[PDB]
Design a protein around this ligand. Structure first.
Ligand code: FMN
Ligand code: FMN
Ligand code: BEL
Lengths: 216, 216
């Protein structure tokens, strides 16, 4: 049951370094990252999955300043994924998406391929020329990916925690992003929790539906 | 189990108006909206859940102009959820968030309630006083809610489609969201697809992992 998973999941404050992810779960984590939906299937993202202790130590360098309380989570967890968004939407990426949709057989006639590319460009240009927020629109898609991911890993029987508490500039310089056209937004350490986790015993807190919801 | 859901779920292009959500599923989707995570448990959102023919007509008014291709989805779906974000993060709302965490039993000492409030304000101030990307940071959390919701409703045996193709100005004014302190971002119709949904039989297409993923 998925509601049980939504009510029982939590943001893990401490992981067990010994409890590693099985090769099956390690593959499944990558499937969730790839198959997440996005506006017009633009998929303006990049993922860095750190499984080695040397790779996790490289990611943990972003939380070395005033974000020290987030360092231990990034090293003790089995798999650590950093979510990156595109800095700008190029015509080459819009071409890469539609050619991949064509290779997969989503279009019957080549005219339908052009109709899809036109509609995608209509949305992409509205954000590039008119609204001037392509960087925010693409980052919004990556945040949708994080939402899909957290629920997916909680349902896989794995513990995770989303981290916004890191210096993005240090993480960009450690992996050579920006020059490659990407920016780090969220870091999600995945694995299993330990007994030092002061959040697994604590109840879940959310505002009531009378304040945040209206039915019409 | 959810890997199966993530690989099988799709964006429905046509719904069946007679196929309604069971009374329990209608309560389950609302739980999914609320129990979603957000940075510092800030929950900078509001949800309008349209289930009546009159309520869905009010939402469908935003599917005008070059967004006419989304009118059917908003009217034929059983339930239509409008994801809204706060326009500005006020201090009275940050107080509402900590007081709810105090009534749920997350803090043992009053020193723990003052420590979380400080930790919330550190992040809140970094976005409203320093970076000035307050509306964008809150909008990101709302998109995180959508990702959680899409995979969530898909695991419930329901069909859905996230919509960005609508007029935010029309929707906002129709529900008077601006004066209440909110803005509409994503509209998600929930129900069951009809035989006219070409996307139900079409294969899922995503970019390969050799382009979007790097293992370290
Ligand atoms: C985008 C995002 C950023 C977050 N950043 C942090 C962080 O830097 N450190 C941390 O310990 N928790 C962080 N969290 C966890 C939240 O505090 C947590 O999701 C929220 O309190 C709700 O609790 P829950 O996850 O147990 O439901 C973040 C959550 C989200 C979704
Ligand atoms: C934020 C967002 C906005 C979208 N807007 C629309 C829309 O206005 N109309 C539509 O038919 N599909 C829309 N989609 C559906 C995408 O095209 C779809 O997610 C993508 O093609 C991948 O296909 P899938 O969802 O079946 O995996 C949107 C998706 C997201 C996540
Ligand atoms: O949900 C309320 C609480 O249970 C915990 N809140 C957080 O998840 C949370 C907690 C912290 N701190 C508190 C400053 Br001493 C670090 C200790 Br874990 C911070 N932070 O300041 O980085 C951010 C979030 N954050 O979410 O960004």
């Amino acid at each position: 049951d998925i509601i049980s998973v939504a009510l029982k999941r939590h943001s893990t404050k401490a992981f067990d370094a010994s409890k590693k992810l099985t090769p099956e779960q390690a593959e499944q984590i990558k499937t969730l990252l790839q198959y997440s939906p996005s506006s017009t299937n633009s998929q303006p993202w990049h993922f860095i999955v750190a499984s080695t202790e040397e790779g996790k130590a490289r990611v943990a360098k972003s939380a070395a300043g005033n974000y020290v309380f987030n360092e231990r989570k990034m090293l003790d967890a089995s798999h650590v994924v950093v979510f990156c968004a595109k800095t700008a939407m190029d015509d080459v990426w819009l071409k890469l998406v539609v050619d991949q949709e064509d290779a997969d057989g989503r279009f019957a006639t080549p005219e339908a391929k052009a109709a899809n590319d036109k509609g995608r460009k209509f949305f992409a240009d509205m954000h590039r020329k008119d609204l001037h927020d392509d960087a925010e629109w693409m980052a919004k898609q990556v945040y949708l990916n994080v939402g899909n991911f957290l629920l997916g890993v909680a349902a896989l029987g794995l513990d995770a925690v989303p981290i916004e508490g890191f210096d993005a500039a240090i993480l960009d310089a450690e992996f050579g992003l920006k020059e490659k056209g990407y920016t780090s937004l969220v870091v999600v350490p995945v694995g299993h929790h330990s007994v030092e986790d002061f959040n697994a015993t604590l109840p879940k807190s959310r505002l009531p539906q009378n304040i945040t919801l209206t039915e019409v």
